């Protein structure tokens, strides 16, 4: 159908929007320590503390097979990354800390999206 294309145009137009907005995000961890899954034969118990990992390899995928329907579903995987970080590694830790920076700093980009996404429809 007609209706059918114009939803899958809207939903490519998001992926265009989220794409910049990954990669504003990834930019405020120049250490990349957010960059890939955190390895399970370098950390094993991981799974053990963490039921839900994520990281922006793993966003990136999923963004380019637009599995992201709306801003949300994207927020909440930024959020697992941030947050999975922050209960694994201690206060004192450089990780601990970089994903503070991060929140911080994704704050500004995901309030301008959200703006974006709601203009735009």
Known sequence: SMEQVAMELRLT???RLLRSVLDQLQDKD????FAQPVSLKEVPDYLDHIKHPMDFATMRKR???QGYKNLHEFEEDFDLII???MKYNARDTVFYRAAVR????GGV???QARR???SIG
């Open 83 to 85: 947050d999975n970080c």
């Open 116 to 118: 974006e996404v709601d």
């Open 13 to 15: 137009e998001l992926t």
């Open 109 to 111: 980009v995901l309030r």
């Open 102 to 105: 991060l929140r911080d700093q």
């Open 30 to 33: 120049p250490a990349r320590i």
């Open 63 to 65: 963004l380019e097979a």
